[PDB]
Amino acid sequence: MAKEFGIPAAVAGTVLNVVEAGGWVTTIVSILTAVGSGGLSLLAAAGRESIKAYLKKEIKKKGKRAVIAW
Amino acid sequence: MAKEFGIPAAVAGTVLNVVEAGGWVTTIVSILTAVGSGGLSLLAAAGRESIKAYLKKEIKKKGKRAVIAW
Amino acid sequence: MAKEFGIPAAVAGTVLNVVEAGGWVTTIVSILTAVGSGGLSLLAAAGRESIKAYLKKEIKKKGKRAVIAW
Amino acid sequence: MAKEFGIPAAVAGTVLNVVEAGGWVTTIVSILTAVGSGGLSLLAAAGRESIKAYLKKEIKKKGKRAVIAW
């Protein structure tokens, strides 16, 4: 999230926690949208999936820590 | 917004009204996204600021009318 | 590219052919830009990689056919 | 260029030098395009101006150093 998108670690951890805790998509969307363009880029990257759905998959494959780094 | 981005006056002035009303970033992002590629380009332009933050700064300097025209 | 981004197969497969041929990033950016907002969204998705770098990585993992479909 | 767009200082200085030396727009466009999305964002930010034309103005107003920082 940092390397690819430039999402600060404190914002990214929050986002992933919300994902892992089955939080509202709209929550994830406001946090990510507030980060500015790096967050907009990560929103764009999901495509037509929900961001929650997308990031869930991403943690499933690389684990929390690597998703924060990415 | 018209000259540089191709955002019809009716859309833009609504976007600016939401800015000046201290409305949600996501709302601005959804209106701009809905205009299509001229709105994605304005989103991209804001870089790592929120689009609200960005448009607020633009209105501060040129004032609402010039920002609509731009 | 179709499923997630809405990029017609005729455009996408050309974009991928340019990737695989080691063509200019700007060329990829101009084709994608020309498709309109689905192409801006794919541009945004790549984050801080070049789009060439990004699509190369996608083809490596899903292979050209799935990347067209995606 | 750094604060707003996340353009590394070595790439940004090069770009501004090219601008100040009346270099080709296509040169500026390939460098900026290669930076990835922060460069695409700065390209989007010019709007319908040429990037050279846009950055020329930007240095005129803030001077080289501040344009690198921005």
Ligand SMILES: CCCCCCCCCCO[C@@H]1O[C@H](CO)[C@@H](O[C@H]2O[C@H](CO)[C@@H](O)[C@H](O)[C@H]2O)[C@H](O)[C@H]1O
């Ligand atoms: C570099 C800055 C990026 C701006 C230019 C490139 C395109 C990126 C612009 C934003 O892309 C996203 O598009 C979607 C539309 O599909 C938009 O929707 C978000 O909010 C919806 C809430 O109603 C939600 O359902 C979507 O999951 C979510 O992606 C998104 O916010 C944009 O960032």
Ligand SMILES: CCCCCCCCCCO[C@@H]1O[C@H](CO)[C@@H](O[C@H]2O[C@H](CO)[C@@H](O)[C@H](O)[C@H]2O)[C@H](O)[C@H]1O
């Ligand atoms: C966050 C990543 C941004 C991607 C999504 C948001 C929109 C930004 C996509 C790129 O925007 C620019 O659009 C222009 C088209 O007006 C495109 O043209 C560039 O190259 C032309 C060369 O033929 C040149 O004449 C233009 O001056 C120049 O801006 C640009 O490369 C895109 O980055």
